[PDB]
Write a protein that binds this ligand. Structure first.
Ligand SMILES: *[C@@H]1O[C@H](CO[C@@H]2O[C@@H](C)[C@@H](O)[C@@H](O)[C@@H]2O)[C@@H](O[C@@H]2O[C@H](CO)[C@@H](O)[C@H](O)[C@H]2NC(C)=O)[C@H](O)[C@H]1NC(C)=O
Length: 234
């Protein structure tokens, strides 16, 4: 995250860190005791999740480690299009209980509104060109922009992809390398998933692209109910 500051230690209880033995590589959102939502492109053959984390060096007392018991991506997703249905559901190998630094964030109940103020967060790079990874997660506020802005900046962004466009018109505040999979929270609602962006990060003509969570809520709920055979909207 660039153009921001260190997050408050209590404002990201739902933030999940994805890591392997090399380090953190993605973020995720705890939506209930046994489920985490992240980006499909954050999938890997071997990884674990750390909950209740703030600083990588100073352990939080209630920090928990979890493994992916089951993973779900849209059955009708085209694997050759990284921007097509970039969302993945993960069932934990063991449920977690609410604690000082751990609590779920509910699925959105209302669609995103252009012009709303949104917050981004993650352990991604805090510098635009060079890669500088912080020990603590950084936070920043940005605006939900008209989809036309991203359309003009990204020739690869097709109209059929269910995405949201966010940042500020002049650039300078944006997600960066390593923030993928994290939540985009607008008006207190989990509205998007960090999905795609450009490098250098924070270019005015190239705002961040986030997966529209609202559109996948029904699919998500059916998988949680036990209908892991459900398909995503075209
Ligand atoms: C730990 O994971 C990192 C990153 O994994 C990749 O990126 C994730 C977002 C997700 O898409 C995964 O499926 C990817 O594999 C690995 O680091 C990458 O390693 C490759 C080659 O080894 C390198 O080209 C990339 O630049 C690295 N990171 C980036 C920028 O993506 C790392 O190898 C994994 N550690 C182990 C031991 O498995």
């Amino acid at each position: 995250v660039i153009g921001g500051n260190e997050c408050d230690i209590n404002e990201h209880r739902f933030l999940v860190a994805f890591f392997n033995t090399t380090g953190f590589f993605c973020g995720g959102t705890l939506i209930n005791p046994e489920w985490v939502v992240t980006a499909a492109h954050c999938d890997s053959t071997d990884f674990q999740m750390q909950l209740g984390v703030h600083s990588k060096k100073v352990l939080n007392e209630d920090e928990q480690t979890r493994n992916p018991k089951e993973k779900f991506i849209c059955p009708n997703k085209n694997n050759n299009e990284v921007l097509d249905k970039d969302i993945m559901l993960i069932k934990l190998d063991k449920p977690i209980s609410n604690s000082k630094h751990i609590a779920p964030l509910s699925l959105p109940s209302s669609p995103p509104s252009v012009g709303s103020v949104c917050r981004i967060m993650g352990w991604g790079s805090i510098t635009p060109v060079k890669e500088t990874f912080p020990d603590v997660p950084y936070c920043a506020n940005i605006n939900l922009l008209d989809h036309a802005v991203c359309q003009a900046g990204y020739p690869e962004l097709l109209a059929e992809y269910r995405t949201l466009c966010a940042g500020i018109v002049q650039g300078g505040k944006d997600t960066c390398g390593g923030d993928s999979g994290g939540p985009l929270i607008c008006n207190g609602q989990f509205q998007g998933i960090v999905s795609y962006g450009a490098h250098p990060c924070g270019q005015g003509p190239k705002p961040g692209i986030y997966t529209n969570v609202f559109d996948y809520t029904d699919w998500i709920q059916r998988n949680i109910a036990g209908n892991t055979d459900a398909t995503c909207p075209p």
